[PDB]
Design a protein around this ligand. Sequence first.
Ligand SMILES: Cc1cc2nc3c(=O)[nH]c(=O)nc-3n(C[C@H](O)[C@H](O)[C@H](O)COP(=O)(O)O)c2cc1C
Ligand SMILES: O=C(Nc1cc(Cl)cc(Cl)c1)Nc1ccccc1C(=O)O
Ligand SMILES: CCCCCCCCCCC[N+](C)(C)[O-]
Ligand SMILES: O=C1C[C@@H](C(=O)O)NC(=O)N1
Length: 364
Amino acid sequence: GDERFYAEHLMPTLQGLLDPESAHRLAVRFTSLGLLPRARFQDSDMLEVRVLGHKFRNPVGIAAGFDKHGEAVDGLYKMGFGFVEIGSVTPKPQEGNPRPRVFRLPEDQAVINRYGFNSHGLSVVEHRLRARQQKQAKLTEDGLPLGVNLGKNKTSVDAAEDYAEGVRVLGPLADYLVVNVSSPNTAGLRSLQGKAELRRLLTKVLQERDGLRRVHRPAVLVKIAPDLTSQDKEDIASVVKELGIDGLIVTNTTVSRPAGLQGALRSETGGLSGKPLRDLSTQTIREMYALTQGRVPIIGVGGVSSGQDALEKIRAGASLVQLYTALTFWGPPVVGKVKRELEALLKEQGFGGVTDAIGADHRR
Ligand SMILES: Cc1cc2nc3c(=O)[nH]c(=O)nc-3n(C[C@H](O)[C@H](O)[C@H](O)COP(=O)(O)O)c2cc1C
Ligand SMILES: O=C(Nc1cc(Cl)cc(Cl)c1)Nc1ccccc1C(=O)O
Ligand SMILES: CCCCCCCCCCC[N+](C)(C)[O-]
Ligand SMILES: O=C1C[C@@H](C(=O)O)NC(=O)N1
């Protein structure tokens, strides 16, 4: 699990041999078989966070979209992530967009994808999680929670009902649910982010959640785009506080193309992730934290590949962070790297632990 060997040799060679979707599929397969490094980094108490009704032994999770179908959850904990989010899962199976649909921008340390919610569907994922449900219960009790990100089918005629089905089927199996209302790659999905129908949508979601038995009742979070107007964000903050949404995930990929991208493939359609997204997502965290008065837990995601990247989102108001794209460039060692650097920076800047640092920028 040597960071330099993966970063300088293994990964560059893998990317030379495999297109990104092939690499992704191979990585999921290897991970689910435990064929990858087991974290030697043992988490210190400084990294522990309590939010969303759970203990997280460290604040660094794997973002949705890597393990879309729930196949590699245990290998991902083994890799050192403090929590795992699977999905997005749609109600029925669907294939997603035609290939190629994932693109590498090496010069920018970025990826563009237009997968389009390729999904095994709720039923398959349900049985997959049921097969390890008790193992997960112990992991969660141990401080390693599981999130499930819910999507909707391309041809769906009623978006709210798709999400409602997801709550009923996978909600009993998840520590938290994510209503993904921010994918760049499904027609019309992102406009579920406007006020009146976001309120209608989330009201129905929360009602379905509340109808689940107490011990099987997940937290519900909303995952938003980096691409929202001031008005959108203002409206989302309002609805979230009004309905009692448990948290926000900030952010999904961007449909923007920031000035300065060098990759040959920069003009491919889809969502951009990685380094070019980093500060855009950090600023969105900062804004949503202020609009919710620091009362609504935020998971910060976008361009995290170092302890500094993570701490900047934490200080901006994130209680937890996720990464994905950094894994595709640096490989598994990046997880321990981020955790180790985060702990060092926390001591360095005088924080007793992660919890003390949450939102710290707003208190200056
Ligand atoms: C290949 C790929 C597939 C993704 N699939 C999903 C998805 O299915 N559901 C979702 O909510 N986010 C998905 N995302 C977005 C990530 O969860 C994350 O929000 C985004 O990539 C920003 O974090 P990062 O810069 O560390 O990659 C995907 C991202 C990538 C790169
Ligand atoms: O996931 C990996 N690679 C990978 C390689 C290793 Cl050696 C380990 C792990 Cl977990 C993942 N790669 C990707 C995942 C999603 C989208 C694009 C890629 C890519 O390669 O461009
Ligand atoms: C029966 C429905 C089948 C849907 C399959 C969708 C593509 C799944 C490809 C493997 C997972 N992955 C995200 C790594 O491409
Ligand atoms: O939420 C999502 C969906 C994913 C996909 O296209 O499957 N692409 C993304 O970048 N974010």
